[PDB]
Amino acid sequence: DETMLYAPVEWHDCSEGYTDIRYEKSTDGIAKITINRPQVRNAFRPLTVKEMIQALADARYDDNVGVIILTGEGDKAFCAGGLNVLDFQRQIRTCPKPVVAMVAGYSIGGGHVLHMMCDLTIAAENAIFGQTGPKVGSFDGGWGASYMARIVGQKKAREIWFLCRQYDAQQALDMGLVNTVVPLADLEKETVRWCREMLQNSPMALRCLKAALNADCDGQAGLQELAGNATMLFYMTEEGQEGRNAFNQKRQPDFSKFKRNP
Amino acid sequence: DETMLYAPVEWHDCSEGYTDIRYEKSTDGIAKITINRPQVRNAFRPLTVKEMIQALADARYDDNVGVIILTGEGDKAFCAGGDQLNVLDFQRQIRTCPKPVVAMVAGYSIGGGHVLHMMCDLTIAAENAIFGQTGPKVGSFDGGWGASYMARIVGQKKAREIWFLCRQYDAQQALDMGLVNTVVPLADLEKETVRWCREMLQNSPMALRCLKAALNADCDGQAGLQELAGNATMLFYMTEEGQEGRNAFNQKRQPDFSKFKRNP
Amino acid sequence: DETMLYAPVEWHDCSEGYTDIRYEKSTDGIAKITINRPQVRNAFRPLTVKEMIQALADARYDDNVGVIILTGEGDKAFCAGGDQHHLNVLDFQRQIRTCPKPVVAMVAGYSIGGGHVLHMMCDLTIAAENAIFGQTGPKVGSFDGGWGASYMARIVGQKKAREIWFLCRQYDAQQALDMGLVNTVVPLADLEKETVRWCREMLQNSPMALRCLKAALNADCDGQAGLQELAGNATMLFYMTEEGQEGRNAFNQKRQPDFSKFKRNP
Amino acid sequence: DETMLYAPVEWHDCSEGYTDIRYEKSTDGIAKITINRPQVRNAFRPLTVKEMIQALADARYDDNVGVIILTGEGDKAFCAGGDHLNVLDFQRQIRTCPKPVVAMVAGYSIGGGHVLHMMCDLTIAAENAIFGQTGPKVGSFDGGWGASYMARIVGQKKAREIWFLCRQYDAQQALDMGLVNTVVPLADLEKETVRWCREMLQNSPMALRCLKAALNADCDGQAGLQELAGNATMLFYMT
Amino acid sequence: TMLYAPVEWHDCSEGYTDIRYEKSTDGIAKITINRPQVRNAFRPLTVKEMIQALADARYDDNVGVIILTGEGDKAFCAGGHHLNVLDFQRQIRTCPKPVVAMVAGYSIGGGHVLHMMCDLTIAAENAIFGQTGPKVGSFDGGWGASYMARIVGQKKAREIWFLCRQYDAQQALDMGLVNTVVPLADLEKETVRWCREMLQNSPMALRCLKAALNADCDGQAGLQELAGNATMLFYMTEEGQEGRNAFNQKRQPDFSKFKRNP
Amino acid sequence: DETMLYAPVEWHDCSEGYTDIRYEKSTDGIAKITINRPQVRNAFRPLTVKEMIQALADARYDDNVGVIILTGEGDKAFCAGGDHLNVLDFQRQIRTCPKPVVAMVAGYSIGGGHVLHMMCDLTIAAENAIFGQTGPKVGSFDGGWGASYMARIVGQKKAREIWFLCRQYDAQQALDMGLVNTVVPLADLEKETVRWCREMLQNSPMALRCLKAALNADCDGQAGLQELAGNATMLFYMTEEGQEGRNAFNQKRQPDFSKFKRNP
């Protein structure tokens, strides 16, 4: 249990070919995407987004990977800011595996919306959060606004966007913006523990819950994900197989043989 | 297979204990609930509604029933409405019924009775069918599904016309605005309704319940998500991974989900 | 009035015919449904659910009942969840939802899995200092993607909801309180005393008002299902007005309705 | 019956102080707001919009008025569009007006003028009515109720066609796709419109108000809930 | 020290009976309910005046933010025949400039719904919050209930409405019901500071973000606001000026000139 | 103007590297994606989907492309369905594409193939087009946009009929119910589709992307808001007030917005 949860982690490198990020995977199922541009507090540029999309797609399709971690190189910044990033936001959202934001230092502007899109956020004590749109003539009125309101509520979301202040780790925790705050030195340790707890659980259940939680926000786009999971489940049932069996066996499909539950 | 679809239908009575309705079941999986108060155009009383709720509850739990027909006694009225709010529980019941419910309408479907046919997944209408609301004329209204859901069927302009003026509409009018699925001769109302039921009966009962939930989900927010997510939970229990918990419990061990592959 | 709010409560048993639950009513309008399977941390089985549905329907139609308490027998568990694939619990969930009377979860000890969704469905939750909360689904290969997910997010927010479901940890009373999952935490010895005080504060208010407010709060989540409840209440109210009675009068009097006299307000 | 429905209509003038519109009321409960700029096909300018806002508020507050008709001067145009975006205010006022609003359309209902007839609860169209949007042709658009609400009337495929191509549609096309409620001969336009208004006027004004809010609530989230709850509150003060 | 500079209010209350209406050279408009006798409860005329003043502020090009408060230190607004206050709530909501509730003392019943509708709430240490409707049989099931849930969550909203208790400033802050709590003597300088931080930001960004946040709640009504801001943004771009330019240049619009971004 | 609409269209081949589809572009800005498996009535397999995704992404990033046509090789079929859920990504991609996507349907558009034409903004159908779902008949279903979005097109009664009975519908029936935009002779399918595309290409591309996002936003909750707001942000960057932020940084000074109006 605990000892297993805190066992060391061996990161296998998969960064070959990438320029702005590092991409790594552990034997037990964690993929980590790290923004590697600390000279600029890990702000992203178009290439960085293109690379993260590629890396996240890789994780999605790697059947040994169960959880993805998003983080920034170093301890001073997760991501200080930036529009292909809209694609990336959708990709995080629709990923059937949990994505955890591991935040040390600055998570600001587009970088702040990135951590919010992640299913969970594990913050270090030196973490700082905030938006900058209105101070620099910009804004994210998509998930950056509505989804934030679903995390911290309408009063706080309006404060965050309208004033563009910075919030420390404690403030973030108190408003329910991050899931937990740990000392900088234990950030990886704690983040890896949370991932491992999720890895012990049913991947199909996580996938359906994530779609279900998205469906409270995304209208039909959410229904598409939720119903897609239902369809996938249905193919794995006897009645769902009677269809293909109808072909192979070459005959009329017979569902009269199947039961009808209330 | 028209000789099969239009094959004769053998109803079997199950109305013992009911006063205001008849309740019958065909040998091939169709349940029929008939309002039996033709003297007042099949309007419903609270008793009529209680009975309908019981009968529908029965059809839902009867493993031999795949589809349900809702209709009125005779050829002149489906249901003229509340005999001039228990009906609200019945509407929800039709809504969340995991089997298709079909309104077979001859003559009047008015007021509360018009909302009834609308709640049904499909409506098969005789050429003599007449439709419309009466609330505002008689100082009342159904601002629930009677309003919003109607708008998901005929569009906002037509829904506003139907409710604000309270006119009556003939079968062609209903058909043209998409309020009913088909119009057939009065004499063929039952054979045609039965054919539609049989076409649905040849399809997967699980696929139909999932689709019904999915279509409701476009309208019912979280209540819709509950229906849809509830179907996903049933499905999951019928898979290997969805049985590991149970297997694990029975074998006195920890569940191991590493045995299962992570799909993209 | 402290004295009135903390006055002794007089319970009357209405458990006859029930096997898995107790059902009691107080002289001052509180109905209490108690899961009575403490040997299994009050886990529910199909019979238990059929019984709660029936007791809740009774409370719903009892004009002398204004509030309903849901709880578990003893101090060790509220409800540990489903017992050892039938899903009648979903009907029960909808029944709690559409009940026009406030439903309060009184939680001592464990509220886990399906048992956790039950307290969340309740309008309010009063927790004892020994209460423990959490889901188990993913940990045991199952899930509740209905109100158990979406409605939970409307209570604690999306970050916490994903955490609660993805990790399946257990949370203590202060943890739950801090995240807005329960309404208050009180000593275990005073659980019923405070719960009854909360019920009585609600009982001082208008049943019709609570009914409309509950429907309005549901409507922010339940789309057309929510509008149905809200519109049903408007319909009730309308029937209690002179304009709404002119229809029936015209009929009784078999003349045409005349709404000409009624003002057409802004 | 029909005799009552088709009885002569007698308009009393309430246009004093208005420049771009006419405003009249019948004693049987109809208020009529007419855009009066036929020289430019009844296109509205900012002044026209504040006047309409002002006339609609008057109508809402006149307890003897149960239904409002919005129309254009003459037989050639209902409203050919905008010539400040205060029309968004007017769209919301029509929406939240507790009384039915009927668009009476002769000729052109185009661009901003098309969105105006759609906002109205009902649309009675003459045989010469022509409908359509123009935004994308002229490099603008109405992505509010002009898009979403339109989809709730004619469906998503048609709404995308109307907006993406900006064609003009005749009265028969409009009727077939559910865009207008009826089509009548140009000379019977007011006669039929007034008939529809009188049928509504025979009904419960409280019922109409609650239903309109209920139908808005299927589209306007919490803002629709606010209207509906406001009605429950009004009903409560009568129990 | 620019944020805490003194504030010069200019009176614009001429003609009003129930309210005071003032403007700062700085760009802040302040609508003050002036009925301390009755704890600043509003009557229909008060609402009519508040609607008129808020419209003035909306149309005053020099005003960027609006403050709503009650006269004195004992009450913001104790509550409320015509329900014109519903129109005022919708006007606060659709106002393209942020509206800040400055609360000293009681914000109860209809007065509580009023502070909630405001984008932000600044409370003094002596502020008291809560509903009273069911105590009287009345109720606000519009934004008064659903919107409150979007602020404090469903459990807390049902509690607030069903029991009708009073909550102090700390409790309101702990639930996320108000944005901050400051001493009574600092209420105005703090509120002015928050306003000035907003006044330094892009007004166009703030209006877009306010519509985006409303849009998560108000369905098509919120879409109308957001799209309307899009239409306004479009008229200020080269492509959105091709129609007007084509006409002035006596020629047909030509959009082939413009790029088609991804 | 009609002369221009019916001018010939020259397609330039961009099919290099594709196995299951053809991908072509006209000089006036039309990108066409053709499912090229007529021997199986143009059913898609996972590879087909991956290729369609790549081609649509290319069309999206091609500044010279303003409209996209999706069609199937030959006159007998648009797409007969699946030949495995990567198609869901493709549906999302058609939805969020900031350029109009037009389904050009000859013959069969069934099952997964029917949902595909429905996801397109518009559908131009030939006289011989046939439409329908098959899920429940073969123990499958599309409860996402296949259900809810369909209902936003033809209404809830028709949607329930289409899914529960799994019948086939001819071109006239489809037109009648609002499932397709127009029906043209088979021989003119190409001609008419290009005309419609050309009508769109004369309009503002920015206006079209904004309207498409606004129309999606009536269905897709926060996912639709992301799209609409994303367009608002793009518009904002093209205004002087948006540019003050970038210019400030560029000019080495803190941003100042006092210069801009505070419009009502």
JSON list of C-alpha atoms in Angstrom, two decimals, chain C residues 99-245:
[
{"chain": "C", "resi": 99, "resn": "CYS", "atom": "CA", "xyz": [-39.94, 14.70, -3.50]},
{"chain": "C", "resi": 100, "resn": "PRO", "atom": "CA", "xyz": [-41.59, 18.08, -2.80]},
{"chain": "C", "resi": 101, "resn": "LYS", "atom": "CA", "xyz": [-40.48, 17.96, 0.83]},
{"chain": "C", "resi": 102, "resn": "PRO", "atom": "CA", "xyz": [-36.92, 18.58, 2.03]},
{"chain": "C", "resi": 103, "resn": "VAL", "atom": "CA", "xyz": [-34.94, 15.42, 2.62]},
{"chain": "C", "resi": 104, "resn": "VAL", "atom": "CA", "xyz": [-32.08, 15.50, 5.13]},
{"chain": "C", "resi": 105, "resn": "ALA", "atom": "CA", "xyz": [-29.30, 12.92, 5.38]},
{"chain": "C", "resi": 106, "resn": "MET", "atom": "CA", "xyz": [-28.29, 12.35, 9.01]},
{"chain": "C", "resi": 107, "resn": "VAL", "atom": "CA", "xyz": [-24.87, 10.76, 8.81]},
{"chain": "C", "resi": 108, "resn": "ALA", "atom": "CA", "xyz": [-23.12, 8.90, 11.63]},
{"chain": "C", "resi": 109, "resn": "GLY", "atom": "CA", "xyz": [-20.06, 6.94, 10.47]},
{"chain": "C", "resi": 110, "resn": "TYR", "atom": "CA", "xyz": [-19.77, 5.58, 6.92]},
{"chain": "C", "resi": 111, "resn": "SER", "atom": "CA", "xyz": [-21.50, 6.96, 3.86]},
{"chain": "C", "resi": 112, "resn": "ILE", "atom": "CA", "xyz": [-19.76, 5.05, 1.03]},
{"chain": "C", "resi": 113, "resn": "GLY", "atom": "CA", "xyz": [-20.40, 3.99, -2.55]},
{"chain": "C", "resi": 114, "resn": "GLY", "atom": "CA", "xyz": [-24.09, 3.94, -3.32]},
{"chain": "C", "resi": 115, "resn": "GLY", "atom": "CA", "xyz": [-24.54, 5.04, 0.26]},
{"chain": "C", "resi": 116, "resn": "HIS", "atom": "CA", "xyz": [-22.55, 8.11, -0.54]},
{"chain": "C", "resi": 117, "resn": "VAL", "atom": "CA", "xyz": [-24.70, 8.98, -3.56]},
{"chain": "C", "resi": 118, "resn": "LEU", "atom": "CA", "xyz": [-27.75, 8.64, -1.24]},
{"chain": "C", "resi": 119, "resn": "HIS", "atom": "CA", "xyz": [-26.62, 11.31, 1.20]},
{"chain": "C", "resi": 120, "resn": "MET", "atom": "CA", "xyz": [-25.61, 13.61, -1.70]},
{"chain": "C", "resi": 121, "resn": "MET", "atom": "CA", "xyz": [-29.05, 13.27, -3.30]},
{"chain": "C", "resi": 122, "resn": "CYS", "atom": "CA", "xyz": [-30.54, 14.49, -0.07]},
{"chain": "C", "resi": 123, "resn": "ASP", "atom": "CA", "xyz": [-31.16, 18.23, 0.11]},
{"chain": "C", "resi": 124, "resn": "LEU", "atom": "CA", "xyz": [-28.98, 18.69, 3.19]},
{"chain": "C", "resi": 125, "resn": "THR", "atom": "CA", "xyz": [-26.51, 16.57, 5.14]},
{"chain": "C", "resi": 126, "resn": "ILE", "atom": "CA", "xyz": [-25.89, 16.85, 8.87]},
{"chain": "C", "resi": 127, "resn": "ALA", "atom": "CA", "xyz": [-22.75, 14.88, 9.78]},
{"chain": "C", "resi": 128, "resn": "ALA", "atom": "CA", "xyz": [-21.44, 13.56, 13.09]},
{"chain": "C", "resi": 129, "resn": "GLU", "atom": "CA", "xyz": [-17.74, 14.08, 13.88]},
{"chain": "C", "resi": 130, "resn": "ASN", "atom": "CA", "xyz": [-17.18, 10.38, 13.10]},
{"chain": "C", "resi": 131, "resn": "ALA", "atom": "CA", "xyz": [-18.65, 10.52, 9.58]},
{"chain": "C", "resi": 132, "resn": "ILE", "atom": "CA", "xyz": [-16.58, 9.12, 6.69]},
{"chain": "C", "resi": 133, "resn": "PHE", "atom": "CA", "xyz": [-17.33, 9.83, 3.05]},
{"chain": "C", "resi": 134, "resn": "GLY", "atom": "CA", "xyz": [-16.33, 8.48, -0.35]},
{"chain": "C", "resi": 135, "resn": "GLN", "atom": "CA", "xyz": [-17.07, 6.47, -3.49]},
{"chain": "C", "resi": 136, "resn": "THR", "atom": "CA", "xyz": [-15.78, 2.96, -4.33]},
{"chain": "C", "resi": 137, "resn": "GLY", "atom": "CA", "xyz": [-16.95, 2.34, -7.91]},
{"chain": "C", "resi": 138, "resn": "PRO", "atom": "CA", "xyz": [-13.66, 2.41, -9.84]},
{"chain": "C", "resi": 139, "resn": "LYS", "atom": "CA", "xyz": [-11.95, 0.57, -6.96]},
{"chain": "C", "resi": 140, "resn": "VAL", "atom": "CA", "xyz": [-14.44, -2.31, -7.22]},
{"chain": "C", "resi": 141, "resn": "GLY", "atom": "CA", "xyz": [-15.17, -2.11, -10.98]},
{"chain": "C", "resi": 142, "resn": "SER", "atom": "CA", "xyz": [-18.38, -0.04, -11.24]},
{"chain": "C", "resi": 143, "resn": "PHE", "atom": "CA", "xyz": [-19.63, 3.57, -11.32]},
{"chain": "C", "resi": 144, "resn": "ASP", "atom": "CA", "xyz": [-22.52, 6.01, -11.00]},
{"chain": "C", "resi": 145, "resn": "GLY", "atom": "CA", "xyz": [-22.30, 8.43, -13.94]},
{"chain": "C", "resi": 146, "resn": "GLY", "atom": "CA", "xyz": [-25.74, 9.95, -13.31]},
{"chain": "C", "resi": 147, "resn": "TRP", "atom": "CA", "xyz": [-26.45, 12.33, -10.43]},
{"chain": "C", "resi": 148, "resn": "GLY", "atom": "CA", "xyz": [-23.62, 10.67, -8.52]},
{"chain": "C", "resi": 149, "resn": "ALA", "atom": "CA", "xyz": [-21.18, 12.40, -10.85]},
{"chain": "C", "resi": 150, "resn": "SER", "atom": "CA", "xyz": [-22.83, 15.49, -12.33]},
{"chain": "C", "resi": 151, "resn": "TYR", "atom": "CA", "xyz": [-24.74, 16.49, -9.19]},
{"chain": "C", "resi": 152, "resn": "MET", "atom": "CA", "xyz": [-21.63, 15.94, -7.05]},
{"chain": "C", "resi": 153, "resn": "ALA", "atom": "CA", "xyz": [-19.81, 18.47, -9.24]},
{"chain": "C", "resi": 154, "resn": "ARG", "atom": "CA", "xyz": [-22.64, 20.97, -8.52]},
{"chain": "C", "resi": 155, "resn": "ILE", "atom": "CA", "xyz": [-21.89, 20.49, -4.81]},
{"chain": "C", "resi": 156, "resn": "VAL", "atom": "CA", "xyz": [-18.09, 20.36, -4.51]},
{"chain": "C", "resi": 157, "resn": "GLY", "atom": "CA", "xyz": [-16.86, 21.54, -7.90]},
{"chain": "C", "resi": 158, "resn": "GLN", "atom": "CA", "xyz": [-15.24, 19.67, -10.79]},
{"chain": "C", "resi": 159, "resn": "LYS", "atom": "CA", "xyz": [-11.69, 19.34, -9.37]},
{"chain": "C", "resi": 160, "resn": "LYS", "atom": "CA", "xyz": [-12.91, 17.72, -6.15]},
{"chain": "C", "resi": 161, "resn": "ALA", "atom": "CA", "xyz": [-15.53, 15.59, -7.91]},
{"chain": "C", "resi": 162, "resn": "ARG", "atom": "CA", "xyz": [-12.88, 14.03, -10.21]},
{"chain": "C", "resi": 163, "resn": "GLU", "atom": "CA", "xyz": [-10.67, 13.45, -7.20]},
{"chain": "C", "resi": 164, "resn": "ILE", "atom": "CA", "xyz": [-13.41, 11.75, -5.20]},
{"chain": "C", "resi": 165, "resn": "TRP", "atom": "CA", "xyz": [-14.34, 9.40, -8.08]},
{"chain": "C", "resi": 166, "resn": "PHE", "atom": "CA", "xyz": [-10.88, 8.75, -9.61]},
{"chain": "C", "resi": 167, "resn": "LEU", "atom": "CA", "xyz": [-9.05, 7.86, -6.38]},
{"chain": "C", "resi": 168, "resn": "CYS", "atom": "CA", "xyz": [-11.91, 6.47, -4.26]},
{"chain": "C", "resi": 169, "resn": "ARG", "atom": "CA", "xyz": [-10.38, 7.70, -0.99]},
{"chain": "C", "resi": 170, "resn": "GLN", "atom": "CA", "xyz": [-12.20, 8.19, 2.27]},
{"chain": "C", "resi": 171, "resn": "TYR", "atom": "CA", "xyz": [-12.79, 11.70, 3.66]},
{"chain": "C", "resi": 172, "resn": "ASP", "atom": "CA", "xyz": [-13.39, 12.72, 7.29]},
{"chain": "C", "resi": 173, "resn": "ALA", "atom": "CA", "xyz": [-16.13, 15.08, 8.50]},
{"chain": "C", "resi": 174, "resn": "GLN", "atom": "CA", "xyz": [-13.90, 18.17, 8.49]},
{"chain": "C", "resi": 175, "resn": "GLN", "atom": "CA", "xyz": [-12.67, 17.28, 4.98]},
{"chain": "C", "resi": 176, "resn": "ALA", "atom": "CA", "xyz": [-16.27, 16.97, 3.76]},
{"chain": "C", "resi": 177, "resn": "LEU", "atom": "CA", "xyz": [-17.29, 20.20, 5.50]},
{"chain": "C", "resi": 178, "resn": "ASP", "atom": "CA", "xyz": [-14.33, 22.12, 4.07]},
{"chain": "C", "resi": 179, "resn": "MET", "atom": "CA", "xyz": [-15.29, 21.14, 0.53]},
{"chain": "C", "resi": 180, "resn": "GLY", "atom": "CA", "xyz": [-19.02, 21.86, 0.99]},
{"chain": "C", "resi": 181, "resn": "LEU", "atom": "CA", "xyz": [-20.03, 18.18, 0.77]},
{"chain": "C", "resi": 182, "resn": "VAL", "atom": "CA", "xyz": [-22.03, 18.30, 4.02]},
{"chain": "C", "resi": 183, "resn": "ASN", "atom": "CA", "xyz": [-23.81, 21.22, 5.65]},
{"chain": "C", "resi": 184, "resn": "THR", "atom": "CA", "xyz": [-22.51, 20.99, 9.19]},
{"chain": "C", "resi": 185, "resn": "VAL", "atom": "CA", "xyz": [-20.49, 18.76, 11.53]},
{"chain": "C", "resi": 186, "resn": "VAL", "atom": "CA", "xyz": [-21.70, 18.16, 15.09]},
{"chain": "C", "resi": 187, "resn": "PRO", "atom": "CA", "xyz": [-20.73, 15.81, 17.94]},
{"chain": "C", "resi": 188, "resn": "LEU", "atom": "CA", "xyz": [-21.94, 12.23, 17.46]},
{"chain": "C", "resi": 189, "resn": "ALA", "atom": "CA", "xyz": [-23.89, 12.41, 20.75]},
{"chain": "C", "resi": 190, "resn": "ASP", "atom": "CA", "xyz": [-25.84, 15.44, 19.45]},
{"chain": "C", "resi": 191, "resn": "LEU", "atom": "CA", "xyz": [-26.51, 14.20, 15.92]},
{"chain": "C", "resi": 192, "resn": "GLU", "atom": "CA", "xyz": [-30.29, 13.72, 16.27]},
{"chain": "C", "resi": 193, "resn": "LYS", "atom": "CA", "xyz": [-30.73, 16.78, 18.48]},
{"chain": "C", "resi": 194, "resn": "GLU", "atom": "CA", "xyz": [-29.14, 19.05, 15.85]},
{"chain": "C", "resi": 195, "resn": "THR", "atom": "CA", "xyz": [-30.80, 17.27, 12.92]},
{"chain": "C", "resi": 196, "resn": "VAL", "atom": "CA", "xyz": [-34.22, 17.78, 14.56]},
{"chain": "C", "resi": 197, "resn": "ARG", "atom": "CA", "xyz": [-33.35, 21.46, 15.19]},
{"chain": "C", "resi": 198, "resn": "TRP", "atom": "CA", "xyz": [-32.54, 21.88, 11.47]},
{"chain": "C", "resi": 199, "resn": "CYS", "atom": "CA", "xyz": [-35.80, 20.13, 10.51]},
{"chain": "C", "resi": 200, "resn": "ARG", "atom": "CA", "xyz": [-37.83, 22.36, 12.83]},
{"chain": "C", "resi": 201, "resn": "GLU", "atom": "CA", "xyz": [-36.26, 25.50, 11.39]},
{"chain": "C", "resi": 202, "resn": "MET", "atom": "CA", "xyz": [-37.44, 24.28, 8.00]},
{"chain": "C", "resi": 203, "resn": "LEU", "atom": "CA", "xyz": [-40.88, 23.37, 9.35]},
{"chain": "C", "resi": 204, "resn": "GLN", "atom": "CA", "xyz": [-41.44, 27.04, 10.36]},
{"chain": "C", "resi": 205, "resn": "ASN", "atom": "CA", "xyz": [-41.44, 27.90, 6.71]},
{"chain": "C", "resi": 206, "resn": "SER", "atom": "CA", "xyz": [-44.07, 27.50, 4.03]},
{"chain": "C", "resi": 207, "resn": "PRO", "atom": "CA", "xyz": [-44.42, 24.00, 2.54]},
{"chain": "C", "resi": 208, "resn": "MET", "atom": "CA", "xyz": [-45.38, 25.53, -0.81]},
{"chain": "C", "resi": 209, "resn": "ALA", "atom": "CA", "xyz": [-42.38, 27.81, -0.72]},
{"chain": "C", "resi": 210, "resn": "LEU", "atom": "CA", "xyz": [-39.96, 24.96, 0.07]},
{"chain": "C", "resi": 211, "resn": "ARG", "atom": "CA", "xyz": [-41.58, 22.87, -2.60]},
{"chain": "C", "resi": 212, "resn": "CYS", "atom": "CA", "xyz": [-41.10, 25.65, -5.22]},
{"chain": "C", "resi": 213, "resn": "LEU", "atom": "CA", "xyz": [-37.53, 26.36, -4.10]},
{"chain": "C", "resi": 214, "resn": "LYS", "atom": "CA", "xyz": [-36.55, 22.69, -4.23]},
{"chain": "C", "resi": 215, "resn": "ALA", "atom": "CA", "xyz": [-37.99, 22.45, -7.75]},
{"chain": "C", "resi": 216, "resn": "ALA", "atom": "CA", "xyz": [-36.19, 25.66, -8.79]},
{"chain": "C", "resi": 217, "resn": "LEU", "atom": "CA", "xyz": [-32.89, 24.30, -7.48]},
{"chain": "C", "resi": 218, "resn": "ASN", "atom": "CA", "xyz": [-33.44, 21.00, -9.27]},
{"chain": "C", "resi": 219, "resn": "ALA", "atom": "CA", "xyz": [-34.26, 22.91, -12.47]},
{"chain": "C", "resi": 220, "resn": "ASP", "atom": "CA", "xyz": [-30.73, 24.29, -12.68]},
{"chain": "C", "resi": 221, "resn": "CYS", "atom": "CA", "xyz": [-29.64, 20.65, -13.20]},
{"chain": "C", "resi": 222, "resn": "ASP", "atom": "CA", "xyz": [-32.48, 18.64, -14.66]},
{"chain": "C", "resi": 223, "resn": "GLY", "atom": "CA", "xyz": [-33.40, 20.42, -17.90]},
{"chain": "C", "resi": 224, "resn": "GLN", "atom": "CA", "xyz": [-36.93, 19.60, -19.05]},
{"chain": "C", "resi": 225, "resn": "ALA", "atom": "CA", "xyz": [-37.42, 17.19, -16.12]},
{"chain": "C", "resi": 226, "resn": "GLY", "atom": "CA", "xyz": [-36.75, 20.17, -13.87]},
{"chain": "C", "resi": 227, "resn": "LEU", "atom": "CA", "xyz": [-39.09, 22.40, -15.86]},
{"chain": "C", "resi": 228, "resn": "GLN", "atom": "CA", "xyz": [-41.79, 19.76, -15.47]},
{"chain": "C", "resi": 229, "resn": "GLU", "atom": "CA", "xyz": [-41.54, 20.06, -11.68]},
{"chain": "C", "resi": 230, "resn": "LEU", "atom": "CA", "xyz": [-41.38, 23.83, -11.70]},
{"chain": "C", "resi": 231, "resn": "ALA", "atom": "CA", "xyz": [-44.31, 24.09, -14.17]},
{"chain": "C", "resi": 232, "resn": "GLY", "atom": "CA", "xyz": [-46.32, 21.59, -12.13]},
{"chain": "C", "resi": 233, "resn": "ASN", "atom": "CA", "xyz": [-46.04, 23.88, -9.10]},
{"chain": "C", "resi": 234, "resn": "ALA", "atom": "CA", "xyz": [-47.05, 26.92, -11.18]},
{"chain": "C", "resi": 235, "resn": "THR", "atom": "CA", "xyz": [-50.05, 24.87, -12.31]},
{"chain": "C", "resi": 236, "resn": "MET", "atom": "CA", "xyz": [-50.98, 24.13, -8.70]},
{"chain": "C", "resi": 237, "resn": "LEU", "atom": "CA", "xyz": [-50.69, 27.77, -7.74]},
{"chain": "C", "resi": 238, "resn": "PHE", "atom": "CA", "xyz": [-52.72, 28.89, -10.74]},
{"chain": "C", "resi": 239, "resn": "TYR", "atom": "CA", "xyz": [-55.60, 26.61, -9.78]},
{"chain": "C", "resi": 240, "resn": "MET", "atom": "CA", "xyz": [-55.71, 28.50, -6.45]},
{"chain": "C", "resi": 241, "resn": "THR", "atom": "CA", "xyz": [-56.37, 31.84, -8.14]},
{"chain": "C", "resi": 242, "resn": "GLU", "atom": "CA", "xyz": [-59.61, 33.35, -9.31]},
{"chain": "C", "resi": 243, "resn": "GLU", "atom": "CA", "xyz": [-58.42, 33.50, -12.92]},
{"chain": "C", "resi": 244, "resn": "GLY", "atom": "CA", "xyz": [-57.48, 29.82, -12.68]},
{"chain": "C", "resi": 245, "resn": "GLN", "atom": "CA", "xyz": [-60.91, 28.98, -11.26]}
]
